[PDB]
Write an enzyme that holds these catalytic residues in place. Structure first.
Site, short mmCIF file in Angstrom:
data_model
loop_
_atom_site.label_atom_id
_atom_site.label_comp_id
_atom_site.label_asym_id
_atom_site.label_seq_id
_atom_site.Cartn_x
_atom_site.Cartn_y
_atom_site.Cartn_z
N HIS A 46 0.81 -1.22 0.00
CA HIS A 46 0.00 0.00 0.00
C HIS A 46 0.84 1.28 0.00
CE1 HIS A 46 0.23 -0.27 4.56
NE2 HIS A 46 0.44 1.02 4.39
N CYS A 87 4.18 1.14 9.40
CA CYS A 87 4.07 0.01 8.49
C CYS A 87 5.43 -0.34 7.89
CB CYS A 87 3.06 0.31 7.37
SG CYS A 87 1.35 0.24 8.00
N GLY A 111 2.96 5.64 10.07
CA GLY A 111 4.33 5.53 9.62
C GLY A 111 5.05 4.26 10.06
C1 LIG Z 1 0.90 1.99 7.95
O1 LIG Z 1 1.92 2.79 8.57
C2 LIG Z 1 -0.38 2.16 8.78
C3 LIG Z 1 -0.24 1.73 10.26
C4 LIG Z 1 -1.43 2.08 11.16
C5 LIG Z 1 -1.68 3.57 11.40
C6 LIG Z 1 -2.26 3.65 12.81
N1 LIG Z 1 -1.88 2.39 13.43
C7 LIG Z 1 -1.41 1.48 12.57
O2 LIG Z 1 -1.04 0.33 12.88
N2 LIG Z 1 -1.50 1.46 8.14
C8 LIG Z 1 -2.60 2.09 7.72
O3 LIG Z 1 -2.73 3.31 7.85
C9 LIG Z 1 -3.73 1.28 7.07
C10 LIG Z 1 -3.75 1.47 5.55
C11 LIG Z 1 -4.70 0.57 4.72
C12 LIG Z 1 -6.17 0.94 4.86
C13 LIG Z 1 -4.32 0.75 3.25
C14 LIG Z 1 -4.51 -0.91 5.08
N3 LIG Z 1 -4.95 1.80 7.68
C15 LIG Z 1 -5.25 1.67 8.96
O4 LIG Z 1 -4.51 1.06 9.74
N4 LIG Z 1 -6.42 2.22 9.42
C16 LIG Z 1 -7.44 2.97 8.67
C17 LIG Z 1 -8.30 2.69 9.95
C18 LIG Z 1 -7.02 2.25 10.76
C19 LIG Z 1 -6.46 3.31 11.68
C20 LIG Z 1 -6.56 3.21 13.07
C21 LIG Z 1 -6.04 4.21 13.89
C22 LIG Z 1 -5.41 5.32 13.34
C23 LIG Z 1 -5.30 5.43 11.97
C24 LIG Z 1 -5.83 4.44 11.14
#
Ligand SMILES: *[C@H](O)[C@H](C[C@@H]1CCNC1=O)NC(=O)[C@H](CC(C)(C)C)NC(=O)N1CC[C@@H]1c1ccccc1
Ligand SMILES: *[C@H](O)[C@H](C[C@@H]1CCNC1=O)NC(=O)[C@H](CC(C)(C)C)NC(=O)N1CC[C@@H]1c1ccccc1
Lengths: 306, 306
Positions: free
Chosen positions: B41, B145, B143
């Site tokens: 992603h 991921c 950040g």
């Molecule tokens: C990649 O760095 C992030 C890690 C997330 C950000 C907050 N805690 C984590 O572990 N991954 C994402 O942002 C991910 C992206 C896809 C939708 C493409 C998989 N989205 C989420 O993790 N999301 C969207 C809802 C949940 C979220 C929870 C809490 C804060 C922000 C986002």
């Protein structure tokens, strides 16, 4: 989100760990520039460790009695000396992996990471607090002496702890890196014991803030309290007094959550008088006191180290 | 003695972490030989992450759209491809700090260490379990991921986890290093949720053995129980069934303490029916299920890694 007992990355310290052998005693040493630091009891034998005279024992050693091993490479010792409860072994090679570092002494209530080591090889890493009675609740077996505790500040490693012994209650005692013990302990076999401990009140409050940041709110309440009335309750439950400087340090956490510090104190008071009633806070059924306000901000905001 | 949630030393993994930037998305990558691994992603934008077509999005990129940063040095990308939910970015330089490694997929109930990272820089290390519902209870912010989970076996790093997302209950979901998710989760913004979890019974028992090794015995009892009668109670309290292979794996711990496995089951049964009555076990007021029998032996016997 989430909250975990988090240690600093350990790689900078791993490159400093060596094995120090004297006679039939082997423990760990810390190799920085051209000096190896290790507990002075490496020079003792079994009968020595009863009531030793370390100056006497050291004058009877020479450089060649110290075998220093950096992985599978032997370091030649060219000088030695005692600094309080540690030995300084001068070797002919400066450690090429020497990080930027400091020797700093910490306060009860502050945290640090421990890199547990055996035979110069790192075994695991975990986070510790210096208890108010100057002990730490660690995980240390035979051969782990010389393992160090540290903090990391950007790229600089502040070494704060060197391990020496276990006390009868299963808790651990050691020195700072200048060889001065934390608390009233000596590196001999006596009948020494820990001494009564207290709960680090400012840290419990910081951890309650971490919980609110992470969505646990069930313990919040509409009441408030004065600092004095809170400290009357803290004394009753063996918590240490809260000062105005502690309140100031909780300011940033107060402002991010919108919960006044004295309001969170009122929540802690109710938790002390009623318990938890079968609920949990951040996966714990006890009030946790081994996270500082700094630890909470660091984790709940994402600071790194390079 | 003592018992702590212990992570593996992280230095071998720290030398593999890089920063991968595509557009305005930055996350972490894992650099081994001449390939960088990262979540796919990274190629999405804000509106892409709703319901993306990753094959479509990737065919519209070229090598120069991927900025890879190893500290303060830029790695030139010479090829790219998708493997399930991860990208493989071929770079012109092999990582000189590549450890011996494997890509292995773990089972619910096993543990591993997480090196949390931001902008390619490690931030902290902690120990995790794969929950029976294929989530992990971590600490991850924006950040993070691309951060990985791993185990160490002598000198060889078995990478088992790459981080991708947080679920609505604050728990975390990711893939193995071949890009296949743990559990029924996808790397899109949908209404996906964890799914009901259970307690890892074999691990609770192992942790009870760790307690006995460390001097907590108050929960021991003279009664015993059959495996069947224990599993009737485990089902009632949402614990997962215990099998004869679990009993066999607890053999070494049974033999070191002299407490038959089925006797320790009887102790757990009483703990489930009565609770703890204001006491604690290894500093916990809950029954802990995130230590494996291997973790207990490793810590209560002192195994290192080189
Ligand atoms: C990649 O760095 C992030 C890690 C997330 C950000 C907050 N805690 C984590 O572990 N991954 C994402 O942002 C991910 C992206 C896809 C939708 C493409 C998989 N989205 C989420 O993790 N999301 C969207 C809802 C949940 C979220 C929870 C809490 C804060 C922000 C986002
Ligand atoms: C140096 O590696 C060890 C570390 C100890 C061993 C067990 N747990 C530890 O933290 N230090 C010692 O062995 C120390 C030596 C001096 C007496 C010279 C300070 N002694 C102890 O730590 N001792 C003797 C009683 C206590 C102990 C408790 C449990 C097991 C063995 C020893």
């Amino acid at each position: 989100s989430g909250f975990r007992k988090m240690a600093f990355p350990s790689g900078k310290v791993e490159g400093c760990m060596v094995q120090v052998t004297c006679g039939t005693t082997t423990l760990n040493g810390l190799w920085l520039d051209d000096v190896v630091y290790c507990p002075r009891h490496v020079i003792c034998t079994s009968e020595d460790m009863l009531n030793p005279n370390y100056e006497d024992l050291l004058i009877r050693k020479s450089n060649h009695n110290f075998l220093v091993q950096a992985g599978n490479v032997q370091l030649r010792v060219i000088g030695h000396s005692m600094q309080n409860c540690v030995l300084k072994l001068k070797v002919d090679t400066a450690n090429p992996k020497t990080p930027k570092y400091k020797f700093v002494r910490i306060q009860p209530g502050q945290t640090f990471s421990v890199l547990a080591c055996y035979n110069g090889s790192p075994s695991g890493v975990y986070q510790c607090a210096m208890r108010p009675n100057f002990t730490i609740k660690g995980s240390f077996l035979n051969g782990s002496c010389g393992s160090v505790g540290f903090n990391i500040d950007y790229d600089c490693v502040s070494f704060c702890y060197m391990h020496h012994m276990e006390l009868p209650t299963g808790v651990h005692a050691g020195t700072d890196l200048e060889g001065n013990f934390y608390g009233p302990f000596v590196d001999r076999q006596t009948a020494q014991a820990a001494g009564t401990d207290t709960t680090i009140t400012v840290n419990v409050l910081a951890w309650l803030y971490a919980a609110v940041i992470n969505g646990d709110r069930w313990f919040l309440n509409r009441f408030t309290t004065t600092l004095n009335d809170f400290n009357l309750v803290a004394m009753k439950y063996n918590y240490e007094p809260l000062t105005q400087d502690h309140v100031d340090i909780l300011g940033p956490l107060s402002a991010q959550t919108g919960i006044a510090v004295l309001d969170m104190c009122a929540s802690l008071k109710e938790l002390l008088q009623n318990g938890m009633n079968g609920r949990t806070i951040l996966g714990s059924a006890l009030l946790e006191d081994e996270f500082t306000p700094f630890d909470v901000v660091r984790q709940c905001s994402g600071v790194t180290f390079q």
